[PDB]
A paper describes a structure:
Phosphorus starvation response 1 (CrPsr1) from Chlamydomonas and PHOSPHATE STARVATION RESPONSE 1 (AtPHR1) from Arabidopsis were founding members of plant-unique MYB-type coiled-coil (MYB-CC) transcription factors. PHR binds to a GNATATNC motif (P1BS), found highly enriched in the promoters of PSI genes and in other cis-regulatory motifs, activating gene expression. However, AtPHR1222 – 358 Olig1 and AtPHR1222 – 358 Olig2 bound a biotinylated P1BS immobilized on the GCI chip with ~20-fold reduced affinity when compared to the wild-type control. Together, our experiments suggest that PHR1 may exist as a tetramer or dimer in solution, and that disruption of its plant-unique CC domain interface reduces the capacity of the transcription factor to bind its DNA recognition site. Together, our in vivo experiments reveal that SPX receptors interact with the CC domain of AtPHR1 via the surface-exposed Lys325, His328, and Arg335, and that this interaction negatively regulates PHR activity and PSRs.
We sought to crystallize an AtSPX1–PP-InsP–AtPHR1 complex either in the pre- or absence of P1BS fragments. Iterative cycles of model building and crystallographic refinement yielded, to our surprise, a well-refined model of AtPHR1280–360 only (see “Methods”). AtPHR1280–360 residues 292–356 and 310–357 are visible in the electron density maps from chain A and B, respectively. Structural homology searches with the program DALI43 returned different coiled-coil structures, with a monomer of the tetrameric coiled-coil domain of the yeast transcription factor Ctp1 representing the closest hit (DALI Z-score 5.9, r.m.s.d. is ~1 Å comparing 45 corresponding Cɑ atoms). However, no anti-parallel four-stranded coiled-coil domain with structural similarity to AtPHR1 was recovered, with, for example, the Ctp1 dimer-of-dimers domain having a very different configuration.
Residue numbers in the entry:
A (entry chain AAAB), C (entry chain AAAB): 310 to 357
B (entry chain AAAA), D (entry chain AAAA): 292 to 356
Write the structure that this text describes.
Amino acid sequence: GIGITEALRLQMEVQKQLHEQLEIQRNLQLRIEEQGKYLQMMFEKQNS
Amino acid sequence: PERKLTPLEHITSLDLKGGIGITEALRLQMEVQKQLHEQLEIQRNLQLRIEEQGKYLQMMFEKQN
Amino acid sequence: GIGITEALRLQMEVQKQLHEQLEIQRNLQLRIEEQGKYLQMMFEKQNS
Amino acid sequence: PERKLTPLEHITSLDLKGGIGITEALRLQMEVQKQLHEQLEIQRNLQLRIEEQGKYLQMMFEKQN
Ligand SMILES: [Mg+2]
Ligand SMILES: [Mg+2]
């Protein structure tokens, strides 16, 4: 079995990977939004 | 995958030559934006739940001491 | 403080929300890929 | 956000009238695909780490019994 020391180490790694996923999602969402901006601009070009 | 794509979300060359690829792409964008918001909701939940599990582990590390 | 019973309940909810995020990512990636397919088709139209 | 977008990832109306909006969108696609793969790597890691924390909690629930 695992001890309390490794359990607390796993807990710290979980929280840091969670925050890490959060930061990747922000950067991902920033890029998806710019894809959307491009798509909206293309759509309006074809209606001008 | 789990939910596979409907004809309204599948973009074919037939769609492009009809000029509806752009609007289907904008539909995909709407769905992706909502899913991203849902995943944002869940990690906030996960962060909160993990932190509560963390305080349980901490208080029992100090009952040794 | 929280008890062992709620700690184990939190653990189950964490794993189920994790799997839940995984399923949302698959569906998200499926849709991003189709956006990419559209973009690749548009790019090749402008080079034909 | 954290990493803001470079001019190579920012899509302006100036880019569209130069006909490079499509290639910048394809650049954004490449970056998004890599980030999605990274987030996939991390949840596998998170699932494995959470499960190991789970077996510690289970074995201590049964040391009561
Ligand atoms: Mg279609
Ligand atoms: Mg640019």
